């Protein structure tokens, strides 16, 4: 119904204005602080190093930023067979971190075609594992239904399936990332959330051991496939309940 589509649109637009005001309140005091710190650090450099002009300073900062935008660290390979395989998977999963991004005009042209004829291909694999996990969930709810309202059985089992994935694909990998990457308890859970939601800001990237990067993508594939199966299972029920 169109009366409900407008109602959801009102909720979403309210959620963005509300959410936007919460983020502003949480990040603008930090942004204001960092704006003052870089201005004071740049002024301190020119104050101590008299031989440097303010324009020659900006030229170097711009050169350091241009190198960073290309993917080269201006401190002290990102396209090796392993890293380029992980970047390909970063496009396919729609995560798109941004730490590694095509800089060549030709590299962009291929990235456009690789996403268009690649993201639906991943849909098939995610749907396949989705159909397989459905068989596991369906048999488990039928086992509880053989013992135990149908809605109460469905809600209890689903929450357990959700929490099962929250330990195996959310908690356990965040613990591994806290030890390997050396991030904080927050940053590890934050990265896992930002990765599995396919948001992928790129502010935290795993592998930034040889078996690490391919095993990280395999975790993404199973991790996504599991929650995608639960979301499919809940959706299918809602449309059945709608009829």
Annotated binding site: 94-97, 198-201
Kindly state the smallest distance separating residue 123's Cβ from ligand TRD, in Å. 4
Determine which residue in the list 94, 99, 158, 171 makes contact with K ion, applying CB under 5 A.
94
Contact with K ion (CB under 5 A) among 89, 96, 130, 165: 96
Cβ proximity to K ion, 92 vs 141, nearer residue: 92
Q: Say if CB 165 and CB 230 are below 8 A apart.
A: yes
| Interface positions, 110-149, toward a second copy (CB under 8 A) | 110-112, 114-116, 118-125, 128-129, 131-132
Q: Which two tokens stand for residue 103?
A: 């800089």
Size of site (CB under 8 A) for a second copy: 112
| 159/161 Cα distance (integer angstroms) | 6
Question: Judged by CB, which is closer to ligand TRD: 43, or 125?
Answer: 125
SS3 for 80? coil
Nearest distance in Å: CB 91, ligand TRD: 11
Question: Residues forming the annotated binding site for K(+)?
Answer: 94-97, 198-201
By CB under 5 A, is residue 99 in contact with K ion? no
DSSP letter string, 117-172: TTHHHHHHHHHHHHHHHHHHHHHHHHHHHTT--HHHHHHHHHHHHHHHHIIIIIIH
| CA-wise closest residue to 90 among 233, 207, 176 | 207
Long-range contacts (CB closer than 8 Å, 24 or more residues apart) made by 206-212: 206/177, 206/180, 206/181, 207/83, 207/86, 208/99, 210/82, 212/180
Contact footprint for ligand TRD (CB under 6 A): 93-94, 116, 119-120, 122-123, 126, 197-198, 224, 227-228, 231
For residue 82, give every residue at least 6 positions away whose Cβ sits within 8 Å of its Cβ, in sequence order, or none: 210, 213, 214
Q: By CB under 5 A, tell whether 89 contacts K ion.
A: no
Residue closer to a second copy (CB basis): 42 or 144: 42
Helix (H), strand (E) counts: the chain: 9, 0
Q: Minimum Å distance from CB 116 to a second copy? A: 7
Among 174, 194, 228, 229, binds a second copy (CB under 8 A): 194
Contact call for residue 140 and K ion (CB under 5 A): no
* Contacting a second copy within 47-86 (CB under 8 A): 48-52, 56, 58, 60-65, 67-72, 74-81, 84-85
């Amino acid at each position: 119904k169109w009366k409900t589509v407008v109602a959801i649109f009102v909720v979403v637009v309210v959620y963005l204005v509300t959410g936007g005001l919460v983020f502003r309140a949480l990040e603008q005091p930090f942004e204001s602080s960092q704006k003052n710190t870089i201005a004071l650090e740049k002024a301190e450099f020119l104050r101590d190093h008299v031989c440097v002009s303010p324009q020659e300073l900006e030229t170097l900062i711009q050169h350091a930023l241009d190198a960073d935008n290309a993917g080269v660290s201006p401190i002290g390979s990102h396209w090796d067979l392993g890293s380029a395989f992980f970047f390909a998977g970063t496009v396919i999963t729609t995560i798109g971190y941004g730490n590694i991004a095509p800089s060549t005009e030709g590299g962009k042209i291929f990235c456009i075609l690789y996403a268009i004829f690649g993201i639906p291909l991943f849909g098939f694999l995610l749907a396949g594992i989705g159909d397989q996990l459905g068989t596991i969930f369906g048999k488990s709810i039928a086992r509880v239904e053989k013992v135990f309202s149908q809605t109460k059985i469905r809600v209890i089992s689903t929450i357990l399936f959700i929490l099962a994935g929250c330990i195996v694909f959310v908690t356990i990998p965040a613990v591994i990332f806290k030890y390997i990457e050396g991030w904080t308890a927050l940053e590890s859970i934050y990265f896992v959330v930002v990765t599995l939601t396919t948001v992928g800001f790129g502010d935290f990237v795993a592998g930034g051991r040889e078996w690490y990067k391919p095993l990280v993508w395999f975790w993404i594939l199973v991790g996504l496939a599991y929650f995608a199966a639960v979301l499919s299972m809940i959706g299918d029920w809602l449309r059945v309940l709608s009829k």
